[PDB]
Ligand binder design. Structure first.
Ligand SMILES: CN(C)c1ccc(C(=O)O)cn1
Lengths: 14, 352
């Protein structure tokens, strides 16, 4: 159950 | 059937009233969408504290010098808004925000620009991000999650009727107001789309499979994202959970979701129909549109009109110490705002 727990940035491209 | 005669007639009349509301809302939106600028300037505000940060700038609590009212000011560094889709998206954001009007959408008050930056001045929502509260408590009970989810359903019904896709649903973008209701912020990925669009954008954990697979996609990506949000609110973590984006993408496309043992069967049924890879089967995207969601068993106790009118008692009221209180936001590194003596990127941002 390892995953991102902090704030997540959006990605504009790619 | 599931409804008796009286219940079915009341639901039908309710859905005709929705049509009536959305037709009037589209008329009001279009008037503002066809005639959108420069409603203030930087020295009209005292800058107080950074409320959040991203790759292009920050949002700051500011105080209007003349009136003393507080606002949230989004500052975008024009020279950081460099990539093609970064630019077009910023114009989307301003134009959409000045034109929409809904109780769960943050209200834009001013917008302006200078030699270095773009500025959008919004209502300040002092209760903080849903994100913080969720991470602090762990998870929300299903009635609590449902109260927030219903507001998002209504907000997406409104936006989609205007041919607007939101494209960045997540707890970080959902602010809690003084009555415990949601205010959606950050329209940086919102766009008017009459059919399909093709930009690869959003937040990894919340991306629908068709975005990841470089397929032209439509407003159904917002309904997928609603499934992710409801799952995360009720579980405390999202359904496609991994340390690196590439691993997240692999899980999303697989078509596999596992649920905590404490999820009700009604919730799991709703989520399997939102987190549906097959677009011919995804709720929100079928012939009955948003009513497949609003009439689902998990929402049986939801009074949709009472939510819209803000008549329902909220599960959580944030504490507020007074105007300008920032106690419900996390702290960020402060960086002085420098305005260059030369205009930067004047042509790339003419319409702002
Ligand atoms: C962290 N960000 C995105 C924020 C914070 C606060 C506000 C607001 O009060 O209107 C808006 N955006």
């Amino acid at each position: 159950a390892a995953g991102r727990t902090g704030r997540r940035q959006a990605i504009h491209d790619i | 059937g599931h409804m008796g005669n009286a219940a079915a007639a009341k639901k039908g009349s309710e859905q005709e009233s929705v049509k009536e509301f959305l037709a009037k809302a589209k008329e009001e939106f279009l008037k503002k969408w066809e005639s959108p600028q420069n409603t203030a300037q930087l020295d009209h505000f005292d800058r107080i504290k950074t409320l959040g940060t991203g790759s292009f700038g920050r949002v700051m609590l500011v105080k209007h010098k003349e009136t003393g009212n507080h606002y949230a000011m989004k500052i975008l560094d024009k020279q950081k808004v460099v990539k093609l889709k970064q630019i077009e998206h910023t114009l989307n954001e301003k134009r959409i925000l000045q034109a929409v009007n809904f109780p769960f959408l943050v209200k834009l008050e001013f917008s302006f620009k200078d030699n270095s930056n773009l500025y959008m001045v919004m209502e300040y929502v002092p209760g903080g991000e849903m994100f913080s509260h969720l991470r602090r408590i762990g998870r929300f009970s299903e009635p609590h999650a449902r109260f927030y989810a219903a507001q998002i359903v209504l907000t997406f019904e409104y936006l989609h009727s205007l041919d607007l896709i939101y494209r960045d649903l997540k707890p970080e973008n959902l602010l809690i107001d003084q009555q415990g209701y949601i205010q959606v912020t950050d329209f940086g990925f919102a766009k008017r789309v009459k059919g399909r669009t093709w930009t690869l954008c959003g937040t990894p954990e919340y991306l629908a499979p068709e975005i990841i697979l470089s397929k032209g996609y439509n407003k159904a990506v917002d309904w997928w994202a609603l499934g992710v949000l409801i799952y995360e609110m009720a579980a405390g973590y999202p359904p496609f959970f991994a340390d690196q984006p590439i691993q997240i993408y692999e899980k999303i496309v697989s078509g596999k979701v596992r649920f905590p043992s404490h999820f009700s069967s009604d919730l799991k049924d709703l989520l399997r129909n939102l987190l549906q890879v097959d677009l011919t089967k995804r709720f929100g995207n079928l012939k009955n549109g948003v009513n497949d969601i609003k009439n689902h068993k998990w929402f049986a106790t939801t009074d949709w009109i009472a939510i819209y009118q803000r008549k329902v008692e909220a599960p959580f009221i944030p504490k507020f110490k007074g105007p300008g209180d920032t106690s419900n936001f996390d702290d960020y590194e402060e960086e002085e705002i420098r305005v260059s003596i030369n205009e930067k990127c004047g042509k790339e941002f003419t319409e702002f």
